[PDB]
Design a protein around this ligand. Structure first.
Ligand SMILES: *[C@@H]1O[C@H](CO)[C@@H](O[C@@H]2O[C@H](CO)[C@@H](O[C@H]3O[C@H](CO)[C@@H](O)[C@H](O)[C@@H]3O)[C@H](O)[C@H]2NC(C)=O)[C@H](O)[C@H]1NC(C)=O
Ligand SMILES: *[C@@H]1O[C@H](CO[C@@H]2O[C@@H](C)[C@@H](O)[C@@H](O)[C@@H]2O)[C@@H](O[C@@H]2O[C@H](CO)[C@@H](O)[C@H](O)[C@H]2NC(C)=O)[C@H](O)[C@H]1NC(C)=O
Ligand SMILES: *[C@@H]1O[C@H](CO)[C@@H](O[C@@H]2O[C@H](CO)[C@@H](O)[C@H](O)[C@H]2NC(C)=O)[C@H](O)[C@H]1NC(C)=O
Ligand SMILES: *[C@@H]1O[C@H](CO)[C@@H](O[C@@H]2O[C@H](CO)[C@@H](O)[C@H](O)[C@H]2NC(C)=O)[C@H](O)[C@H]1NC(C)=O
Ligand SMILES: *[C@@H]1O[C@H](CO)[C@@H](O[C@@H]2O[C@H](CO)[C@@H](O)[C@H](O)[C@H]2NC(C)=O)[C@H](O)[C@H]1NC(C)=O
Ligand SMILES: *[C@@H]1O[C@H](CO)[C@@H](O[C@@H]2O[C@H](CO)[C@@H](O)[C@H](O)[C@H]2NC(C)=O)[C@H](O)[C@H]1NC(C)=O
Ligand SMILES: *[C@@H]1O[C@H](CO)[C@@H](O[C@@H]2O[C@H](CO)[C@@H](O)[C@H](O)[C@H]2NC(C)=O)[C@H](O)[C@H]1NC(C)=O
Ligand SMILES: *[C@@H]1O[C@H](CO)[C@@H](O[C@@H]2O[C@H](CO)[C@@H](O)[C@H](O)[C@H]2NC(C)=O)[C@H](O)[C@H]1NC(C)=O
Ligand SMILES: CC(=O)N[C@@H]1[C@@H](O)[C@H](O)[C@@H](CO)O[C@H]1O
Ligand SMILES: *[C@@H]1O[C@H](CO)[C@@H](O)[C@H](O)[C@H]1NC(C)=O
Ligand SMILES: *[C@@H]1O[C@H](CO)[C@@H](O)[C@H](O)[C@H]1NC(C)=O
Ligand SMILES: *[C@@H]1O[C@H](CO)[C@@H](O)[C@H](O)[C@H]1NC(C)=O
Ligand SMILES: *[C@@H]1O[C@H](CO)[C@@H](O)[C@H](O)[C@H]1NC(C)=O
Ligand SMILES: *[C@@H]1O[C@H](CO)[C@@H](O)[C@H](O)[C@H]1NC(C)=O
Ligand SMILES: *[C@@H]1O[C@H](CO)[C@@H](O)[C@H](O)[C@H]1NC(C)=O
Ligand SMILES: *[C@@H]1O[C@H](CO)[C@@H](O)[C@H](O)[C@H]1NC(C)=O
Lengths: 1026, 320, 49, 86
């Protein structure tokens, strides 16, 4: 029988309290929605692999315990749990399967404690684990109405007991205990744990309230990657997919003869060290088991090649040098090691790749009278360079005189052989050493291991091996022309791109198996739970071959684009304004096709229209809108200060004195951060402190109907900010700060407090509304707000009469615009995106920096006190120096990212200062600089680490068609508009301004004469009044 | 904009080794910060393109009767004959810039995400801006596009630089011929020399050189036995295989960090260029600028955007 | 490393241990050069602005 | 090309039929490797050997060059043959 585990198999990962924190764990869990076994235990009158989840609804315990082990036949020590009315008994002994076992010849562990078990059948969930010889039990008890097996619900299993057993467990069994042996029935549930990454949500009480299975579906994958239970609408790049290989292919040359390395191992006479013999061994097979199957060795020693692994490599060529060495000199053959025989007899290069085998030879080499046959020379002109021979038995002038002829005074030929004896050799007895020295994976291999070749496959990615070169990918017919000596083909990236078949001499191209980006396109998690998956730059004919989540791989909705293959969205022909960009002009949305679904489509670039251009047709606006739009600009960022000493190593004197040598690095870091902080203060000063004096609004706030109450400060509030300023302050959300402070990362307060920043803003507001642009240049000169507005109108080419003749309408439009700003700021939280994401970037940078302290950087731990406690002084120092280099690199990375962020913030602050100079302190002509439309004025508003400009703009509306002429010919002479344009309603012609329909009689004042009407193209006929 | 790049730690640093993956997952913080920075850069490239080009609410179309008082915009307006709805000058610019090593880059985990806007839709945005400029003038930048004869728009642009509008109407044919001959000279200069599109070409070359240097860093040993992990795993048991692997990981992670930092600085300079391009589209294309030597040398009259590979070309028309 | 001067490292060490010190020294100095060049790139960006 | 490093003697060779123009034309071609031998012997001087078919009088000619530790740049064609060097 089988069933589905919805949300069972969750337990507290460790005995640690938390609160209101989403924690990501990687451990053995029962996967969500898993195929769990429904076991039924009946009497007639299981492998324990990677943890086990056991669920029992049963009462009147028929399961009276469990059994655990590897063999359960007393060959290995077994574990048993047994339960009765009052308590439980745990026994770990040599149990031979109390009818359950016969005798306990060897007992090591016993345990007695309180019992672990506490139609209304109730669940007693247990988790059984064994890690590093520690056997852990987790449990939880829940009452259920017994609707059915494993209902819907969430609960964790709190830990009860852990036992340091330290025995092998592979298989486990459940007892069937009887009080006769009457027939009975039972039922319980078995689940198998797997290494999975889970996300746990902690309540205020620290109880694990909910969990997310990161590796079950794309939606939960995005949830785990963002470390949140809610995912905002968009597209998120999740873990990359890789098409797994099918099988393994091994191609070695068909060589079957054996390498006689055993011959040099049992040679009758070994050549002496001065005349040691080497020969090439090749074109055969090699093994490291027969060398000790014939005779046990004494010393195995090699660099860069593990003794076990050499069976899986193929060798280009190998040399075996066998010779007799004195028992005490066994460590003289090491690279770099010098001595008498090293310098005068034989030595090997420092970069030596090979393995050494030494064994005793006293019983074959030592003689009762002394074996004076193994000669060695201690006399030479100078040192012997590696892999060279000296066999000249000529007299060496050891003394000050040129000792020539047969011999000389204190001058000796090669030294007399040792008198080696069987019994006198107590540690000095002769030994035989054999060095195998080789280079591999440079030339075509001839000598291989016992491993046999396999069949060749093509157009299917596999674990290919060629003479020890092992890789993974597809093989293809080669169009390249190799040469007889050539065996490998490399690319720019120093990686194999073509290989030669060792058995068929054929050349094959190599291409790693297809892979690419995996992105998850989701609407709001609240809105829906169905998602789309994009495989980036992957052919849609290949992912069906890739049929870990395979639920969506069923297809039937697959859409191909340049960006890649999209699964789980339906392509539609019509075009909408696009919210989630896929790439290459494809956008995904979630709407009704009446059911809701995710769709993909070609994005529209807005509404299609054709402007009615003609010979003589102009469109003149008859109305306007005073549109007030908010522009948010970051100005400063959180001034951060960091001290090396506390962060890199708090309260550690040894670490402090090892770090003081990096004083230059630390001073550079402090200088950079201090520069950044002073630059933040300078940014704020440049943006806000553009006024010599603090101006004050008059108590009589009468500005010809313009209502500035929402932007002017309210004296009632202690911090003298405005309504809009208060809303902006509340919108941005500014504990982890305590941990940041305690790890040596401090936040310096800004020089200007929010109160004085608000006072600067209020002074700018008062200056703007009472003086206009004059206070920017020199002394503030008072002017009625109506006339300042008339001037701003005159600035955008609109005659000032328009504003005075529509003063009330413009005032009402401005007031309603401010009302709409208030409503938009109060309703949606997406208004102050830029300031919020700047704060989020700073917070994320500091959180990443504080998380870097958990990084070990190749140390035994991350905490320095444990390093000192668990290591000797030298090892402690050689770990802590690497740890300090790592943490200093993390600090340097943080400071560099902060420098780049501060550069972008300085760019934004320079732009904000320019906007305060050109939009607030004056009227700008730069198109789309101070808001969309014809800029009239701007109002600064302080915001957390930024400014908000209320760009007031004139936007024409209610346009009308008119017939127009480039000039008028009245008395044979062309007439041109002084400042305006000629338009005709159909019968009469009029001169009008360009941004507001107002016709005027064509007279001599508004027109000027130039030449005659025979040269101008499109001139018309009319009359001009004197 | 620049080529939106994406990097996978597992593919680049570790290739396809399980043991390398387990030794690397401890440095997950570093990899997540690198991916976050690169994703920020790519979204910033899309935002740069949107800010520069997508400044217009509606896609305008030029009327079939292309009569603009002798100004013939055939070389800059899109040609329906060609499948790619670009112009003659746009086609020349596309051909001039040149975009195997890309296959090796892809196989080493360094991928190029396609831009959100295709060259076709970028050309359509440019064509909409062209149609708005030649049929409405500066009005379509402010609010609703208001049609106006090109002659009158030219008279207005003349009035902007302190030249009385009578000058243009009394010399309409001469100015139209001068403009046509100027466009001819632009076509000849673009067709003849390959040094015209220096900036876009060197930007592409900088990106290609950065990726080539990154892929070449894989040959560096970083004090290990070898620069290939697979032979290290094959020839070594865990206890020193892992210390060689972790040195290799530290080296390659430092190379990736260096690449990402250089990309952040390059993206900052590209963002500066894109902000300047958006300002030039706002002040030169969507209106007449008074800033001296901003929209070309002389008294600026108007500008015409032209899409180009990862960039824009302004045909600054100036009175000299 | 043992010291900050290469000449004494060469004088007092046989090639292998000399090179295993020198490579660490080169990595340190190359990191210092990279830091200098990165700071110069940021300074040059601000100077270009 | 004859080399000996750490007691290993390597031979490189190539055959190029040439016209009757003059000694050492502008012709370029690389020498493919033939064999390496484990000589393990100190080598300072070499001399070549001549055959005679007597001792008939005759004339011959060869060319000797000395190798140095140098840095070269090699250009590979589509066939992988070293086409040019710098
Ligand atoms: C608007 O301006 C266009 C650019 O000057 C112009 O296009 C040019 O038109 C002529 C035809 O009058 C073409 O001349 C060619 O004609 C054939 C077919 O292509 C060729 O075999 C000839 O060799 C000759 O070169 C030009 O190719 C064409 N383009 C260019 C770049 O000159 C229009 O004619 C103008 N139209 C109006 C109404 O003003
Ligand atoms: C200005 O008029 C144009 C078209 O001119 C019209 O021509 C005659 C048919 C007659 O009706 C005249 O009085 C008109 O002036 C308008 O352009 C069209 O607008 C409609 C929407 O009403 C649209 O469906 C068409 O596609 C447009 N035609 C073209 C060629 O673009 C235009 O809307 C008028 N402007 C205003 C502000 O109303
Ligand atoms: C956290 O635990 C506390 C303590 O048990 C809970 O407080 C109790 O809540 C219940 C239900 O509202 C009340 O009947 C009790 O009177 C409360 N006791 C006390 C001492 O306050 C609290 O509800 C728990 N919170 C959560 C979210 O689980
Ligand atoms: C210009 O547009 C405004 C609205 O933007 C018009 O004002 C409206 O006028 C009508 C009729 O008098 C009133 O019912 C509305 O209440 C007004 N709206 C507002 C917001 O006050 C104005 O009439 C238009 N101008 C002209 C000349 O028609
Ligand atoms: C400016 O607008 C505000 C809000 O629209 C007005 O404030 C209201 O004023 C009335 C009368 O003084 C009070 O009864 C309300 O409680 C106020 N509401 C708020 C939200 O403050 C203010 O009166 C307007 N100013 C002028 C001069 O009309
Ligand atoms: C075009 O505008 C003119 C100017 O007002 C209009 O002419 C007037 O029309 C009214 C109503 O018929 C007469 O009372 C005036 O005497 C006319 N004045 C002049 C100077 O002619 C004309 O009606 C308008 N036509 C249209 C179609 O709008
Ligand atoms: C505008 O009026 C003038 C004179 O009232 C017209 O000029 C005459 O045009 C006719 C036909 O082209 C010629 O034969 C006459 O010699 C012209 N007279 C003068 C004094 O120049 C002119 O044609 C009218 N405009 C239009 C468009 O018809
Ligand atoms: C690379 O090698 C191939 C084969 O040796 C050459 O291909 C020959 O090229 C000549 C000249 O173009 C043709 O006449 C032959 O028909 C080709 N033979 C084959 C089998 O393809 C090729 O030319 C070489 N590359 C170069 C640059 O010379
Ligand atoms: C952040 C956000 O947009 N949330 C909304 C949510 O409030 C609303 O209930 C739902 C259905 O309209 O759509 C979504
Ligand atoms: C569980 O797996 C077994 C063996 O493949 C299968 O017979 C059974 O149908 C599965 N049950 C579920 C619910 O998947
Ligand atoms: C339970 O078993 C243990 C050990 O076998 C024993 O000491 C105890 O007396 C038993 N209790 C009952 C109630 O059976
Ligand atoms: C493999 O065996 C065949 C038949 O004996 C032989 O022709 C071939 O040469 C062998 N392979 C190699 C690489 O020599
Ligand atoms: C996918 O492969 C097929 C080969 O059958 C090819 O025709 C097609 O063009 C490929 N897809 C894309 C998007 O290039
Ligand atoms: C879109 O239209 C084409 C014809 O131009 C048609 O083949 C296709 O089926 C349509 N798309 C869908 C999703 O039906
Ligand atoms: C456009 O204007 C010119 C100049 O008057 C005229 O010659 C031409 O006929 C006009 N075209 C149309 C279609 O009215
Ligand atoms: C090799 O021979 C030369 C020639 O005399 C000699 O100087 C040199 O010392 C020899 N090499 C060694 C290692 O002795």
């Amino acid at each position: 029988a089988y069933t589905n585990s919805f949300t069972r198999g969750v337990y507290y990962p460790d005995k640690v309290f938390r609160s209101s924190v989403l924690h990501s764990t990687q451990d053995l869990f029962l996967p969500f929605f898993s195929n769990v076994t429904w076991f039924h235990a009946i009497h007639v009158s299981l492998p324990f692999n990677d943890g086990v989840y056991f669920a029992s609804t049963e009462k009147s315990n028929i399961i009276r315990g469990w059994i655990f082990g590897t063999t359960l036949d007393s060959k290995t020590q077994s574990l048993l749990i047994v339960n009765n009315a009052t308590n439980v008994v745990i026994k770990v002994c040599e149990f031979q399967f109390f009818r359950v076992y016969s005798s306990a010849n060897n007992c090591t562990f016993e345990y007695v404690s309180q019992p672990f078990l506490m139609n209304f059948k109730n669940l007693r969930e247990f988790v059984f684990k064994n890690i590093d010889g520690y056997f852990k039990i987790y449990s939880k008890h829940t009452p259920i109405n017994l609707v059915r097996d494993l209902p819907q619900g969430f609960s964790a299993l709190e830990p009860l007991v852990d036992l340091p057993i330290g025995i092998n467990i592979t298989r486990f069994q459940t007892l069937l205990a009887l009080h006769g042996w009457t027939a009975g029935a039972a039922a319980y549930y078995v689940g198998y744990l797997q290494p999975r990454t889970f996300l746990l949500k902690y309540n205020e009480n620290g109880t694990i309230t909910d969990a997310v299975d990161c590796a079950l579906d794309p939606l939960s994958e995005t949830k785990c990657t963002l470390k949140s239970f809610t995912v905002e609408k968009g597209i998120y790049q999740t873990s990359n997919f890789r098409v797994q290989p099918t099988e393994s292919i091994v191609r070695f040359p068909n060589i079957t003869n054996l390498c006689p390395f055993g011959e040099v191992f049992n040679a009758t006479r070994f050549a002496s060290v001065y005349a040691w013999n080497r020969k090439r061994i090749s074109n055969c097979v090699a093994d490291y088991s027969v060398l000790y199957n014939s005779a046990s060795f004494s010393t195995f020693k090699c660099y860069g090649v593990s003794p076990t692994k050499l069976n899986d490599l193929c060798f280009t060529n190998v040399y075996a040098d066998s010779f007799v060495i004195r028992g005490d000199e066994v460590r003289q053959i090491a690279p770099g090691q010098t001595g008498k025989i090293a310098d005068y007899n034989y030595k090997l290069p420092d970069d030596f790749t090979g393995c050494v085998i030494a064994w005793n030879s006293n019983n074959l080499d030592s003689k009762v009278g002394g074996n004076y046959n193994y000669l060695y020379r201690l006399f030479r002109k100078s040192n012997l360079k590696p892999f060279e021979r000296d066999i000249s038995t000529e007299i060496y002038q050891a003394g000050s005189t040129p000792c020539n002829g047969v011999e000389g005074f204190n001058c000796y030929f090669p030294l007399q052989s040792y008198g080696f004896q069987p019994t006198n050799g107590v540690g000095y007895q002769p030994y035989r050493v054999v060095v195998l020295s080789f280079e591999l994976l440079h030339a075509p291999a001839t000598v291989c291991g016992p491993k046999k070749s396999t069949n060749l496959v093509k157009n299917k990615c596999v674990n290919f091996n060629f003479n020890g070169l092992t890789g993974t990918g597809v093989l293809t017919e080669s169009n390249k022309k190799f040469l007889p000596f050539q065996q490998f083909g490399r690319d720019i990236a120093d990686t194999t791109d073509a290989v030669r078949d060792p058995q068929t001499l054929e050349i094959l191209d190599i291409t790693p198996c297809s892979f690419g980006g995996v992105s998850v396109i989701t609407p709001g998690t609240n809105t829906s739970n169905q998602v789309a998956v994009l495989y980036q730059d992957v052919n849609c004919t290949e992912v069906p071959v890739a049929i870990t989540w395979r639920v969506y791989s069923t297809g039937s909705n697959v859409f191909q684009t340049r960006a890649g293959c999209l699964i789980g969205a339906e392509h539609v022909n019509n075009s909408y304004e696009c919210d989630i960009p896929i790439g290459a002009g494809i956008c995904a949305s979630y709407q009704t096709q009446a059911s809701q679904s995710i769709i993909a489509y070609t994005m529209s670039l807005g509404a299609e229209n054709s402007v009615a251009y003609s010979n003589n047709s102009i469109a003149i606006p008859t109305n306007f809108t005073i549109s007030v739009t908010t522009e948010i600009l970051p100005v400063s960022m959180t001034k951060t200060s960091v001290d090396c000493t506390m962060y890199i190593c708090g309260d550690s004197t040894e670490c402090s004195n090892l770090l003081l040598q990096y004083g230059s690095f630390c001073t550079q870091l402090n200088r950079a951060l201090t520069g950044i902080a002073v630059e933040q203060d300078k940014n704020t000063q440049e943006v806000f402190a553009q006024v010599k004096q603090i101006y004050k609004t008059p108590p009589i706030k009468d500005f010809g109907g313009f209502n500035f109450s929402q932007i002017l400060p309210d004296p009632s509030k202690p911090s003298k900010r405005s309504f809009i300023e208060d809303l902006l302050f509340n919108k941005v959300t500014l504990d982890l700060i305590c941990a940041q402070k305690f790890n040596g990362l401090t936040v310096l307060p800004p020089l200007l407090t929010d109160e004085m920043i608000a006072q600067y803003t209020s002074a700018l507001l008062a200056g703007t509304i009472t003086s206009g642009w004059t206070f920017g240049a020199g002394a503030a000169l008072q002017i009625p707000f109506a006339m300042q507005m008339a001037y701003r109108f005159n600035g955008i080419g609109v005659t000032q009469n328009v504003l005075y003749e529509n003063q009330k309408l413009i005032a009402n439009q401005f007031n309603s615009a401010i009302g709409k700003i208030q409503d938009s700021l109060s309703s949606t939280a997406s208004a102050l995106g830029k300031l919020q994401d700047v704060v989020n970037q700073n917070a994320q940078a500091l959180n990443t920096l504080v998380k870097q302290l958990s990084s070990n950087f190749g140390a035994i731990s991350s905490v320095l006190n444990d390093i000192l406690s668990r290591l000797d002084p030298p090892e402690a120092e050689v770990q802590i120096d690497r740890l300090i280099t790592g943490r200093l690199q993390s600090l340097q990375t943080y400071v560099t990212q902060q420098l780049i962020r501060a550069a972008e913030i300085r760019a934004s602050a320079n732009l904000a200062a320019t906007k305060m100079s050109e939009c607030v302190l004056g009227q700008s002509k730069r198109v789309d600089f101070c808001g969309k439309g014809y800029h009239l004025m701007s109002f600064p508003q302080s915001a957390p680490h930024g400014v908000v400009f209320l760009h007031v703009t004139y936007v024409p509306a209610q346009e009308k068609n008119f017939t127009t002429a480039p000039a008028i010919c009245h008395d044979g002479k062309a007439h041109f508009p002084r400042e305006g344009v000629f338009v005709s309603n159909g019968t009469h012609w009029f001169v009008t301004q360009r941004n507001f329909y107002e016709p005027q009689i064509i007279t001599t004042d508004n027109t000027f004469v130039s030449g005659n009407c025979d040269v101008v193209i499109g001139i018309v006929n009319n009359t001009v009044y004197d």
